[PDB]
Symmetry: C3
Subunit: 231 residues, 3 copies
Amino acid sequence: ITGRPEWIWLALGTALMGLGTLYFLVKGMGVSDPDAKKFYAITTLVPAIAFTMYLSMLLGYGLTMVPFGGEQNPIYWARYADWLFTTPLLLLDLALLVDADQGTILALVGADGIMIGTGLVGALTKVYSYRFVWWAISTAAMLYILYVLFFGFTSKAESMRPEVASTFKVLRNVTVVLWSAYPVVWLIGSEGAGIVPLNIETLLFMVLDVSAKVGFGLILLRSRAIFGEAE
Amino acid sequence: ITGRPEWIWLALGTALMGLGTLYFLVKGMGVSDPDAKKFYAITTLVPAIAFTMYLSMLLGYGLTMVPFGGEQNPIYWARYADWLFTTPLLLLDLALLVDADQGTILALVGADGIMIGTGLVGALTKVYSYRFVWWAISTAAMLYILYVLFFGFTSKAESMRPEVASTFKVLRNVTVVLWSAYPVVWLIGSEGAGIVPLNIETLLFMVLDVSAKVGFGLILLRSRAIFGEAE
Amino acid sequence: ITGRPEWIWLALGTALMGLGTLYFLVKGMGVSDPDAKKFYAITTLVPAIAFTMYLSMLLGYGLTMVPFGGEQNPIYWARYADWLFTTPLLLLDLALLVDADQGTILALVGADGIMIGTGLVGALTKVYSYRFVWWAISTAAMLYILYVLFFGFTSKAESMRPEVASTFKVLRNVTVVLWSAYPVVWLIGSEGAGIVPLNIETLLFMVLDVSAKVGFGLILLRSRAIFGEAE
Ligand SMILES: CC(C)CCC[C@@H](C)CCC[C@@H](C)CCC[C@@H](C)CCOC[C@@H](CO)OCC[C@H](C)CCC[C@H](C)CCC[C@H](C)CCCC(C)C
Ligand SMILES: CC(C)CCC[C@@H](C)CCC[C@@H](C)CCC[C@@H](C)CCOC[C@@H](CO)OCC[C@H](C)CCC[C@H](C)CCC[C@H](C)CCCC(C)C
Ligand SMILES: CC(C)CCC[C@@H](C)CCC[C@@H](C)CCC[C@@H](C)CCOC[C@@H](CO)OCC[C@H](C)CCC[C@H](C)CCC[C@H](C)CCCC(C)C
Ligand SMILES: *C/C=C(C)/C=C/C=C(C)/C=C/C1=C(C)CCCC1(C)C
Ligand SMILES: *C/C=C(C)/C=C/C=C(C)/C=C/C1=C(C)CCCC1(C)C
Ligand SMILES: *C/C=C(C)/C=C/C=C(C)/C=C/C1=C(C)CCCC1(C)C
Ligand SMILES: CCCCCCCCCCCCCCC
Ligand SMILES: CCCCCCCCCCCCCCC
Ligand SMILES: CCCCCCCCCCCCCCC
Ligand SMILES: CCCCCCCCCCCCCCC
Ligand SMILES: CCCCCCCCCCCCCCC
Ligand SMILES: CCCCCCCCCCCCCCC
Ligand SMILES: CCCCCCCCCCCCCC
Ligand SMILES: CCCCCCCCCCCCCC
Ligand SMILES: CCCCCCCCCCCCC
Ligand SMILES: CCCCCCCCCCCCC
Ligand SMILES: CCCCCCCCCCCCC
Ligand SMILES: CCCCCCCCCCC
Ligand SMILES: CCCCCCCCCCC
Ligand SMILES: CCCCCCCCCCC
Ligand SMILES: CCCCCCCCCC
Ligand SMILES: CCCCCCCCCC
Ligand SMILES: CCCCCCCCCC
Ligand SMILES: CCCCCCCCC
Ligand SMILES: CCCCCCCCC
Ligand SMILES: CCCCCCCCC
Ligand SMILES: CCCCCCCC
Ligand SMILES: CCCCCCCC
Ligand SMILES: CCCCCCCC
Ligand SMILES: CCCCCCCC
Ligand SMILES: CCCCCCCC
Ligand SMILES: CCCCCCCC
Ligand SMILES: CCCCCCCC
């Protein structure tokens, strides 16, 4: 484990995702509202999945070597197995908050799968220049997601209860800022141009992951928007 | 790329799926009917997924070598990753058109997963004679799907609006004819008996894919069956 | 095939899953109740999936070698591909029986995916002591599932029709007893401590699989709880 300088950030990430999972699990014990139960189930699964994948990276299972640039490059593939399941769950939290229609939910989840799937292909591609073709396709899929979150959901939240509109607006802004950083870290990190070393890259993804999952969840599950209007 | 004679058909397929995706995306911009939005989302995702997998084959990522018959045989595995997601989406288009019940939808999607999954196992199997055992199981799963589309959905469409009944009947006939060709191309192509060479096999799958996805989508999204009855 | 002593139990399992699939398929022909159709579709898919994965193990495709303990250990990975899809389908049978809320269904299916996913990682892990870390995480996920089936569903079934309450109680008890045996067989078998040899381990999993899928299905599909109350 300790033979890799980035191990400290993988261990911290593992701990923070595990602690986040347990807090949400305990906090959700005393909840019977069927609407609130939906948000607790979605939001608790997110850091639980991330916990297992951070642990796999810490123990060395989620790491492979990819030859490109005449070098064997360490690629943590477990990140994409994490994101494949956690990013659509996070979008479902937002879509259920605004009572989005089914067709829009399917478009979001499908574009998200394309985003993560093409990012994985780009991470494992051995022809250096082709890695950035996949990065560009994946980034186009992300821009579609961000467009929908702004010019489809925002207008839908305003016609909703005030507390669900204000909570959505906050979580929307958090998501757009944090998610946009991921393609940048990829491009300048060891998967892309190799400007930033792997140990610093790992620290950046850990800060982003914890903020986008645990921080996101703390804002959502403390809001009254997750409960139905009741007397 | 150009070192493979089949590259021209992979490049054409990539272009036609990309163009198809963009047309459906633009055409769906001016749509607010929640029913129509469902069909546009399903139908636009189909060629978008196929685009990415054709590109992976063009660039050489979606290709592996499988030893059988005393030879290293080029097997494009990316086809099955495509079909795993696009064939159930196409069946969902048909099932939603006739307002099929949930139990029937699950049976269709499950049989479809078995069809594609066993076809993938057959494509990667190293014992030559066993490849055709998997082909037979996969073909049995397809025949179940075709039976349901005829002796379960057809009777359901007649009790529906006339425009949804006539549109379903057309898309049903297109699907049964085109899908039935796939097991035949597999059997006589490089995955099976090896009668037809890979470059011709690739041309045939490209014609079938574009027809079953883009051609299918053009018929559906030009129909009024996708809109609810409104004044 | 016959070069492996466990082949006899893989062949028996294949036959019993295939026969089970055909019986459920025939029995479900004469069913039009939309509620009953749901249970028949879920319950017939379970042994059909298991059939294909037992066949892959029989023919040698679903087997790999994992080095640990200074030895190349035969690991049947196809079991986890089976369980990944069949265990959530079995939980869906139970959840639909008691009309569970959506949030609870998602929590069950998500915990089940974590259970199977971490068990697969543990089966393929090359550092011997780490294999049991994954076993423990997977077992914690199972205990969560069992808790929900007892202290969330049981109370919900009592407020239901008497026949659905008594049928659920029976299937609940069958599930908790049979599922609990799996982590024990893993721990003492070739994936874990290696006390029980592989051929005996394979026999035990076959008895458990057939009972948990075909036996489970025979109890459910003979009950009147799967039909709506009708005159
Ligand atoms: C509606 C939305 C959900 C739609 C989703 C969008 C999606 C279509 C976007 C594209 C996804 C696609 C790129 C997934 C590729 C997975 C692949 C990286 C797995 C590893 O295989 C890659 C190479 C080794 O580098 O295999 C070496 C050769 C091996 C012999 C490969 C044989 C196994 C194949 C991988 C079998 C295909 C399985 C499916 C891809 C499983 C789904 C994986 C997940 C990442 C989507
Ligand atoms: C309700 C419906 C959706 C049900 C679906 C029906 C489905 C059950 C039908 C059978 C599907 C099954 C054959 C999928 C097999 C995937 C497999 C080809 C992936 C590549 O692995 C094959 C060998 C190399 O040749 O791995 C070499 C050895 C490696 C060490 C393998 C270890 C990884 C395992 C593959 C882990 C299992 C992952 C799941 C199979 C992922 C789903 C893939 C998709 C193709 C279903
Ligand atoms: C809501 C719920 C459904 C959530 C589900 C819970 C889930 C997150 C729990 C953890 C699942 C995770 C451990 C799955 C790992 C699959 C992995 C074993 C496949 C084989 O790859 C392992 C190594 C060889 O030993 O690959 C060698 C290196 C290769 C180069 C690997 C590159 C391919 C990657 C495997 C791509 C990721 C694909 C996804 C993991 C596909 C889903 C598989 C299924 C088992 C979940
Ligand atoms: C909890 C994890 C989250 C919210 C991860 C989000 C990840 C992304 C938005 C990743 C995007 C990428 C691109 C847009 C292209 C480059 C490759 C990716 C996958 C890093
Ligand atoms: C857009 C792609 C489509 C509609 C693909 C359809 C593919 C099939 C219907 C494939 C069927 C197969 C068999 C029936 C057995 C032989 C292997 C397959 C997977 C080619
Ligand atoms: C039809 C198959 C069924 C119902 C299989 C159930 C399997 C389990 C409940 C497996 C559980 C495991 C653990 C709890 C940890 C050890 C590894 C597993 C996956 C065997
Ligand atoms: C979206 C965030 C990207 C900003 C990356 C900042 C990295 C600064 C760290 C110093 C770079 C290390 C280079 C010298 C080793
Ligand atoms: C009462 C609110 C705080 C509860 C404690 C939460 C502990 C989980 C770890 C959170 C750290 C990361 C927060 C986002 C920066
Ligand atoms: C379902 C369509 C299958 C028909 C295949 C027709 C192939 C004819 C092309 C000529 C065969 C090439 C053999 C000589 C190289
Ligand atoms: C107005 C209808 C035609 C629009 C142009 C569609 C261009 C997408 C490519 C379609 C070619 C394949 C059609 C099926 C044979
Ligand atoms: C949950 C069931 C686990 C019980 C396992 C009993 C196995 C007894 C078979 C004899 C053990 C073989 C050891 C000598 C070869
Ligand atoms: C009339 C009920 C029996 C029908 C025959 C079922 C045959 C399928 C194989 C069942 C054997 C396994 C039963 C569970 C132990
Ligand atoms: C194995 C991959 C299957 C999933 C394909 C994605 C489409 C799923 C459609 C689900 C239809 C709704 C069923 C109720
Ligand atoms: C990782 C594979 C999980 C999918 C298994 C297929 C069954 C899914 C059941 C979904 C139940 C409906 C939830 C609302
Ligand atoms: C185009 C939709 C408007 C909202 C999206 C904001 C774009 C942020 C740019 C992200 C940069 C990634 C490289
Ligand atoms: C048996 C259901 C009737 C409709 C299915 C038509 C069968 C077409 C044969 C396809 C040939 C594939 C080898
Ligand atoms: C803790 C929830 C109560 C019901 C679960 C029964 C636990 C059975 C123990 C299984 C042993 C697996 C190692
Ligand atoms: C080795 C660098 C080659 C540059 C390729 C950049 C491709 C980016 C595509 C974005 C449209
Ligand atoms: C090398 C050819 C061996 C023939 C096997 C055919 C199997 C087909 C099974 C269809 C029932
Ligand atoms: C080689 C045996 C090492 C023992 C590790 C046991 C780990 C079990 C963790 C359960 C909390
Ligand atoms: C609940 C605390 C979980 C912390 C265990 C993971 C941290 C790795 C320490 C080496
Ligand atoms: C929108 C046009 C997309 C065409 C790019 C793919 C074709 C491959 C050319 C080499
Ligand atoms: C319907 C009977 C299915 C039996 C075939 C599988 C058994 C393997 C025999 C070698
Ligand atoms: C993106 C930063 C999240 C901050 C988490 C703190 C929330 C406390 C209510
Ligand atoms: C299967 C052939 C499809 C033909 C596509 C043309 C549709 C234009 C309306
Ligand atoms: C767990 C044992 C199941 C027994 C199956 C027999 C059911 C006949 C109704
Ligand atoms: C009005 C809410 C502002 C939230 C933005 C937070 C950016 C990290
Ligand atoms: C909408 C604000 C985008 C912020 C992008 C930050 C990328 C590091
Ligand atoms: C009555 C519609 C006929 C459609 C069949 C088209 C076959 C390619
Ligand atoms: C229902 C007509 C089937 C046509 C099969 C064509 C196979 C090449
Ligand atoms: C295995 C075939 C079953 C025969 C019919 C059983 C009575 C519905
Ligand atoms: C009251 C029903 C008892 C069922 C338990 C069966 C254990 C195999
Ligand atoms: C609730 C009874 C548990 C039985 C466990 C059996 C494990 C072999």
